[PDB]
Ligand binder design. Structure first.
Ligand SMILES: Nc1ncnc2c1nc(C#CCO)n2[C@H]1CCCCO1
Ligand SMILES: Nc1ncnc2c1nc(C#CCO)n2[C@H]1CCCCO1
Ligand SMILES: Nc1ncnc2c1nc(C#CCO)n2[C@H]1CCCCO1
Ligand SMILES: Nc1ncnc2c1nc(C#CCO)n2[C@H]1CCCCO1
Lengths: 262, 262, 262, 262
């Protein structure tokens, strides 16, 4: 099959990449970083995130694998010592799919609606001023949020920034998204739900500005300043990310290993 | 159809019940509190909870309706003023189904395994002593919990005790259950996940005692002392509760009305 | 000086106690467990807690020391290896004082007001039914609390149950007490402050029942069922606990060692 | 006495200011906005904050008063209807003092150490990149913090941004400061205390960069980008803010009115 390998860029990951390429040379495998079918990431979850967004227009044609040259990652969950055994089995596997989050940003006249895909989460903050947005759920006005910002998370993203904000961890088999608050203002006049909210497929969460229309929007690692925003729309994506599965590594064990002990 | 009406017992709910019965007398409706097909609760969510557990062996044969004579309930979500219009449409509807939580309690020799169905949540605390349990997820040892106790919640139960413990609110269309912690002990030697955990259908969460085998187990309102416990097992029930739907009252609007404003 | 040693009761702590007694025999030290001036605890914070309440009517005449035969305790903060060097310096020190919490329980006719001293915290829960109390601060009605219960903590108790409820850690030099909530119910009709509250010396926090007058009150380890309660009053005690200081072991380092790493 | 009045700038506050000035003209009072002894703020807590920082080099010579033309403020806690009765009593009072927070920012060669005074809080975030700092308490290395940032709060600031981050509310008579975390990263390799920390007078909390030396530092409303930072130091200020007291308005009642009900 066609394949490519991305590297964190340090010495450990570059040599590992060069050794796997050499191992792949002993099989019917063609290196192609334009239309690969197997994408291998060597580094951390950040390296895997970059590999995902690098190829996010061929997600239905690609199965990802992550190798962690540092600590255990949630996406890079195979040790460097398994690389050789990984080359062999990649050459001759099952696939598991995780849900993704779609963000739609609409603007006033002059700019076209832009859409982004997130594997971890999409957050909105203000640009300088105070963050105030009306939160609309399936066209129902739910609340007026005042605070630092909001975070909408994928299931596999619940162990990342979502977790730091008090969000719940969701098994990635659940097709959903989770909205969490960042330092809500709650008094007698300002009211938010406080609790995290978990939304099923086909529920649209819409943030609508009340005064300032400039927001700092971050999709996974990338953070962009958007100007003259009319609406931010969240929903579970119809696209899914595909992982090549070469052994049983249960999500709850991955959670245990990363947070309890290993 | 066969029907019955349960009342909170106060004057307001008894008269409302008597008026609806009289209204039902003007239609082909037979009062039967043994094998009803329509079960109407008049009071609060507590009254509705009692009506649910009263008939939990015929859940596939019953459609529930709740009338709130006090504030808006999450299950009793129709005002007393709609009773007459409710009698008419009940006489001539759609059904919506919410998931339920199954709790299995196993003991040592002398007592048989007992199973309970919860509409809101099932909690475990200690009986006097300290609460320490090993949390096992699909036979994987996840953590050793020390604290006040644990709460496993249904989706519709997430707005109840789950919410008070920092849990997330889940739309009831998501077939899942949510485990929350009660005052976890976390230091350098004792470690819990801290975050709430959301489990899909067919994941089994198992609590296993480490020293004391006596626990206070509460299913919805009812709290029982169980002795010589060997295991407590949580999973999404295969049974579902059925609601008669006579108008659109979205869950997220029900959340807004109960917590933000009405 | 007069002295006594209490032991956890296991083999390790009993031998350690017997060796220190033998070491004390080589100095002008008289064992007296009725009117000691130096009270040594060997075990954990639980053993130290028992030693405190055992002698809480002579707190101004006693300097405490704790030896931890298990992990580092916040009160038993000297390793067993320092016992011999501890015997020598005890024989020939400075004193540091931590604030205490006073709880007053008032009843109806038939029972006299009872007062308790806490080194860690004093908590109130319901007895079976729901917990609802009016919280009164210096005779000002502050809130009506509904939930599992409330916890009032000393400064040195902030690392114990207070910490598990989201409370803040306070340096023990601050003469104060901290009230934390246990699973507050907050909706459109029920409102609590949510945040922990820190009170200075001479502020009186008063819990007043609204329906049930039976509460389970726990002072440190001891939990008592009180019946026909008219008021529960919290305030910083005028009494202080005295520790014999034989080296610099800063509180913030004790916190670091117990929760970050050692 | 010498006095001045600052206004929110809207129509309601400007007329109120003009009426009080006219009322002051009927007494021996000289308007002076250079060396006033009584500083009156008309607007919200933001207007009062600006009045504080406008005159923060004569805090020992000034007694502040706040009038809230909108909702009740924690510093602007007198209604516009009391303005006339306020002019009379200002003309003929007691003073109460709240503690302040001092922030010291040190840089590399080229820039001198800068110090700031906060009435509410001082926060540190990163500038673009990830926020990682070593937290040092009285020269003791306490933790390495990774997250969004940290917030150090005054006692009267505990009801503001501190409260939104889970901090405790402290009565302003307690001379202390409170450090809270902003979205801490906690796994098996990264550890923070999680709990808020309350520090007494003379404890120095020092943030030390580990990689990036550029931080966005906010003192009350003002947020500055500081470059090439070597250290950020927090401590309770020796200066105090003085309020003119014309009636009993207890802090806990002010908390009740702003968050529970009024
Ligand atoms: N999916 C995830 N689940 C849990 N943790 C995650 C996840 N992704 C990332 C990331 C990243 C780079 O942008 N991280 C952590 C890794 C350690 C540094 C902080 O971020
Ligand atoms: N499903 C629920 N979602 C949100 N809130 C709920 C739910 N059920 C109950 C209940 C009950 C009686 O046991 N409650 C609240 C009602 C107010 C008194 C506290 O409990
Ligand atoms: N002052 C304290 N600061 C932090 N932790 C504390 C404190 N006291 C105690 C206790 C006790 C026995 O009742 N503990 C912990 C020790 C581990 C078991 C749980 O309780
Ligand atoms: N000391 C304070 N205690 C509680 N709340 C506070 C405090 N100061 C401020 C402010 C400000 C302007 O920068 N606020 C609130 C007012 C409503 C808008 C959000 O900030």
């Amino acid at each position: 099959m066609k394949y490519m390998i991305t590297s964190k860029g340090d010495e450990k990951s570059d040599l590992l990449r060069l050794n796997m390429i050499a191992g792949f040379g002993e099989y019917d495998m063609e290196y192609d970083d334009v239309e690969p079918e197997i994408v291998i990431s060597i580094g951390g979850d950040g390296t895997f995130l970059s590999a995902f967004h690098q190829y996010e227009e061929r997600l239905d044609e690609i199965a990802f694998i992550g190798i962690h040259t540092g600590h255990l990652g949630f996406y890079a969950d195979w040790r460097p010592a398994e690389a050789d055994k990984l080359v062999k089995l990649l050459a001759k596997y099952q696939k598991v799919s995780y849900p993704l989050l779609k963000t739609t940003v609409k603007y006033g006249i002059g700019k076209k609606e832009a859409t982004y895909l997130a594997l971890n989460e999409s957050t909105v903050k203000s640009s300088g001023g105070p963050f105030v947005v009306d939160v609309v759920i399936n066209d129902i006005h739910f609340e007026r949020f005042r605070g630092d910002g909001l975070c909408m998370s994928t299931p596999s993203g619940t162990t990342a920034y979502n977790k730091s904000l008090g969000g719940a961890l969701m098994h990635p088999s659940i097709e959903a998204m989770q909205l969490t608050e960042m330092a809500s203002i709650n008094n007698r006049v300002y009211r938010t739900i406080g609790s995290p909210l978990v939304f099923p497929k086909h529920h649209v969460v819409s943030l609508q500005p009340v005064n300032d229309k400039d927001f700092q929007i971050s999709v996974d690692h990338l953070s962009i300043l958007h100007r003259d925003v009319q609406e931010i729309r969240y929903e579970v994506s119809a696209k899914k990310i595909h992982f090549a599965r070469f052994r049983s590594f249960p999500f709850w064990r991955r959670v245990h290993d990363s947070f309890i002990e290993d």
